[PDB]
Design a protein around this ligand. Structure first.
Ligand SMILES: Cc1cc2nc3c(=O)[nH]c(=O)nc-3n(C[C@H](O)[C@H](O)[C@H](O)COP(=O)(O)OP(=O)(O)OC[C@H]3O[C@@H](n4cnc5c(N)ncnc54)[C@H](O)[C@@H]3O)c2cc1C
Ligand SMILES: Cc1cc2nc3c(=O)[nH]c(=O)nc-3n(C[C@H](O)[C@H](O)[C@H](O)COP(=O)(O)OP(=O)(O)OC[C@H]3O[C@@H](n4cnc5c(N)ncnc54)[C@H](O)[C@@H]3O)c2cc1C
Ligand SMILES: NC(=O)Cc1c[nH]c2ccccc12
Ligand SMILES: NC(=O)Cc1c[nH]c2ccccc12
Lengths: 552, 552
């Protein structure tokens, strides 16, 4: 099994046992079920609705502000004539340790067999200060980057020597988790938290690798080695722009195996949303319970919940699950004006939780030019482009079309794309930036038929008003917000704290920016709805079985 | 004298000496003056052009992409029928310690007599966790905030005791500066740098105030006191959103006096750009040297610099000064794709320098409702509005219209505003947010004539494509970039490294987001042009006298 470190609990076993036996809970026969509203038809909203319907709730409606279901899962098609070629605007890489996510992938038969082309997994080039460095598939990175590669590796496997007592190897904390040693894992993790809770990624690695006991034996040169590490990353490409994030946010990804064995979904991750939506309950598809209307203010009148809709219409429900951004929760739903729905502590979590910026631009090329020619499959660059990924969506047809994620950027690197919103203009600027160092590669970056309107697709998540940010990533000192947001639906365990409204979505999880977070929070919030309204939960449920007590 | 800490040099006395002695430099009869381009007609550009023209460079042209001069200086008028009511979209508060800025303010007769209504200077309320806290003018802050107030004050006056070597009190370093103890000041500041170079604001105050030697002998509570302090700030309102910024950036503002005694300019800071542009040289106003065309790629042909503009037009120059954002320098001017104009080190500084986000919304109300009524003049809120400032633009007419800076936000707080770009919508959201805690105050927040189009003004600097960011504020470990950018014009001292292009603007200064920075770098880049082209500089010039070599 694979319990996550912050909760010491795996959703996989529970979901397996419940698939068999009638869902996450039930009501006695003849019981009138609550009218439930779910704000948002992303993965979290669809999963929650799914398990609520499976548990016996007759009336659930999902509100959606976009013209499509799926939210930050968005496998956009260039050309519906040729739907296999897709641009994954949002979620893209999927770790098998995300057992909550993988429960539903396995269920709907959405293949995760193929590995994702991460740097170091396929032929990779790192572009750094004008030079091209080669990183052969399945090999150690080029020699320049070796000190920092090995230093990070040694940190994962060796831990870190502090004088007042050392810290357990992340890879050992991972072994503990897989082997059911949960008290042991908890103590080891608290150890890290105590030391690095108020330290950024950059700050932490400075202390670790320039101090008295650097893992790997070599003490990192500053700033040179930190620039190198920033370009090399830790499995997902250059992490320079997230150097300001809490070091604990990085560690938990590693320990939870989210930087490991990433898979690609050739069918597109949108097929998870399609299949969830295609489920039929009581003769009616989930998709048909989606109301395409933006929700505004959410208010409380006695023991009931009032949803304002964009029509001006106003509908009342018994319980509501909210999966929109914490930004939407503050500014649109107005959930932070008072103590009507959330405590002051949780309201602070909602108001102050950090969402990243992120942008992507894709191009559909005539050919998969990188295969038969001399070229890298992936390029990680200190230039504008940042992360380049070449994608093969039909490996058995080597002469099919190419999909190139020409630029994938985070935070500042993405905030840069904000001027030049014209995708033609952005594309050519990016190609020209890449061409400064690898003109041979850039020469193939032309859209099919020279049509930039059709065969270039881009998106900035930060300025998307349906998202207001790409994904949550806590700064140092802010992990407690994840705790508060994750355990918010556990108010259903305490009728005096239970306002009938529960927060959900990966932004309210311990895994911001991972569909796993959406799934876990969906399960917690769906369970809360059942318990709050007199239903009984299946044994092993998260509301009773998560008892982790960390201090952040 | 007020020499700033990072350069140990004051621009004031030099500019005073040069004023009536023929500028910063001169050419012998027999030396031809260069043809110069300056990209950008903000304060930095205008000052540079001014001093080049004063030194007898006859051919200087300024390029400007906006529909106006002044850049991030922008005293926007609500209604030209009533032009005295202005909204300071950019620069707003001016510290007398900014002796470069004040040299020009004084020269042009721009009044700075009136003190800016900072938190604690005028009657103030802090709104925090749904409660109001009163802060009478000139008094200590409310009791809730007293411990963190006094903690900061003790840090400033005592410094920081640590075992490896205690750090001199910032107020003592400021004293060394003023008394001309520059060698002692440098040692003092280098000490702080050694300790906190790689530490964020939050991380530093955490170590300082939860450690063994909390200034004031009072240890702060985590997280409680850091939330209070995030709301309290250090003289400029709630600094919570800049908690990720390098501590050294916070310290240098304090030491340089930029947090003391801010002045308001009733005529609007835009009157500086106006007065600069109104100056006449060689029969021609500076303003008529401004070419309103966006500069694209900048290139090198022979030993000349080619400027591309937005028509397809193109001009050739001997020397160029670039004051546009680092983002423009990388993506528009393409200064970073090679070592044509900038070293790899300076190119990195250009690419990786952090610009903040920041937004303002102003409303013009029928009356100065805060004067007659009990109401605070300033509010600092943990809510959506963050910073609220009431502005009196005709103090002798108590019946005049009032200007309210309804919301002034930075970083994440400003990033929240990017959805809802409609100003009626944004205005009412902010007003509603404030009304939750102070409904009486909010009842006055109505635009004149109820016209939200005419009497509300707002700007998001982050998505402004002429700025691509509000102002520069280094993260931990990035102060080296400020050094690199500030000293780039000193390449004129080295003909081997002199590429004929020089960087300027506050973004390239040690004073990111202060006009002082734009002035300092303007004087530097002008001196560079002169020396590079065979003119001699007046004694006391920054190219010769700035010899600080700190380790960042
Ligand atoms: C760039 C990017 C890359 C990512 N990479 C990965 C990855 O590699 N692997 C991975 O597992 N995950 C990845 N993620 C994270 C993943 O996409 C999310 O964890 C997942 O989509 C969770 O969705 P959710 O349901 O929690 O929220 P969402 O998907 O955002 O769903 C919320 C829904 O609410 C709707 N809404 C908003 N406002 C209203 C309103 N006012 N009224 C009604 N509806 C409203 C929105 O339209 C949205 O559809 C990535 C995300 C981004 C952005
Ligand atoms: C929100 C905010 C608040 C501030 N508050 C204060 C304060 O209280 N006190 C203080 O002293 N300072 C403050 N500042 C900082 C102050 O505004 C700056 O230091 C100063 O205005 C910058 O002048 P500059 O010439 O260096 O840069 P800019 O003013 O940015 O000048 C650059 C010029 O180049 C132009 N340009 C851009 N691209 C091109 C192009 N491609 N081709 C041709 N031209 C181009 C731009 O339009 C702009 O006019 C504040 C700034 C902001 C943003
Ligand atoms: N699933 C992802 O790779 C997105 C993401 C989540 N957390 C991150 C931290 C840094 C960079 C990307 C991410
Ligand atoms: N002159 C200003 O107030 C803007 C500014 C410069 N540096 C800052 C740091 C934090 C907040 C504002 C600023």
């Amino acid at each position: 099994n694979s319990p996550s470190i912050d909760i010491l609990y795996d959703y996989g076993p529970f979901l397996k046992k419940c698939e068999m036996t009638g869902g996450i809970g039930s009501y006695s026969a003849g019981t009138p079920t609550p009218r439930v509203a779910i704000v948002g038809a992303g993965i979290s909203g669809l999963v929650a609705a799914t398990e609520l319907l499976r548990a016996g709730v007759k009336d659930v409606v999902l509100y959606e502000s976009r013209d499509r279901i799926g939210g930050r899962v968005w496998s956009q098609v260039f050309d519906q004539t040729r739907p296999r070629y897709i641009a994954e605007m949002g979620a893209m890489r999927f770790p098998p340790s995300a057992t909550g996510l993988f429960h539903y992938l396995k269920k709907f038969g959405i293949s995760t067999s193929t590995t994702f082309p991460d740097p170091g997994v396929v032929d990779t080039e790192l572009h750094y200060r004008g030079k091209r460095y080669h990183w052969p598939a399945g090999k150690k990175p080029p020699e320049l980057f070796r000190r920092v590669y090995e230093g990070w590796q040694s940190l994962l496997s060796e831990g870190y020597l502090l004088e007042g007592g050392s810290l357990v190897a992340p890879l050992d904390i991972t072994a503990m988790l897989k082997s059911g040693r949960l008290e042991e894992a908890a103590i080891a993790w608290q150890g890290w938290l105590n030391v690095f809770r108020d330290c950024s990624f950059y700050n932490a690695i400075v202390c670790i690798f320039t101090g008295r006991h650097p893992p790997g034996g070599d003490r990192w040169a500053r700033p040179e080695d930190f620039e190198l590490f920033g370009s090399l990353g830790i499995g997902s490409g250059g992490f320079l722009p997230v150097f300001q994030a809490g070091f604990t946010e990085i560690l938990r990804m590693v320990i939870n195996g989210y930087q490991s064995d990433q898979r690609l979904i050739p069918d597109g991750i949108s097929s998870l949303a399609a299949r969830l939506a295609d489920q039929s309950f009581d003769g009616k598809a989930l998709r048909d319970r989606v109301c395409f209307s933006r929700v505004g203010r959410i208010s409380r009148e006695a023991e009931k919940i009032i949803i304002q809709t964009e029509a001006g219409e106003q509908r009342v429900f018994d319980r509501v699950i909210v999966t929109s951004s914490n930004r939407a929760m503050q500014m649109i739903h107005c959930l932070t004006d008072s103590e009507s729905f959330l405590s002051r502590d949780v309201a602070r979590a909602v108001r102050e939780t950090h969402l990243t910026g992120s942008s992507k631009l894709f191009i559909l090329t005539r050919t998969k030019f990188w295969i038969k020619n001399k070229l890298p499959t992936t390029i990680q660059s200190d230039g504008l482009v940042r992360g380049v990924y070449c994608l093969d969506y039909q490996p058995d047809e080597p002469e099919g079309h190419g999909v190139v994620l020409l630029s994938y950027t985070w935070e500042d690197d993405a905030q840069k794309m904000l001027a030049m919103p014209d995708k033609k203009t952005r594309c050519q600027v990016l190609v020209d930036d890449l061409a400064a160092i690898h003109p041979t590669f850039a020469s193939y970056l032309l859209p099919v038929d020279g049509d930039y309107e059709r065969y270039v697709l881009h998106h900035d998540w930060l300025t998307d008003p349906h998202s207001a940010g790409a994904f949550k990533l806590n700064y140092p000192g802010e992990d407690v917000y994840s705790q508060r947001l994750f355990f918010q639906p556990m108010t259903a365990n305490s009728p005096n704290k239970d306002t009938g409204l529960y927060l959900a979505g990966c932004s309210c999880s311990f895994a911001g920016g991972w569909i796993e977070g959406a799934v876990q929070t969906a399960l917690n919030s769906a369970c809360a709805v059942l318990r709050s309204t007199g239903g009984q939960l299946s044994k092993g449920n998260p509301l009773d079985c998560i008892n982790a007590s960390y201090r952040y």
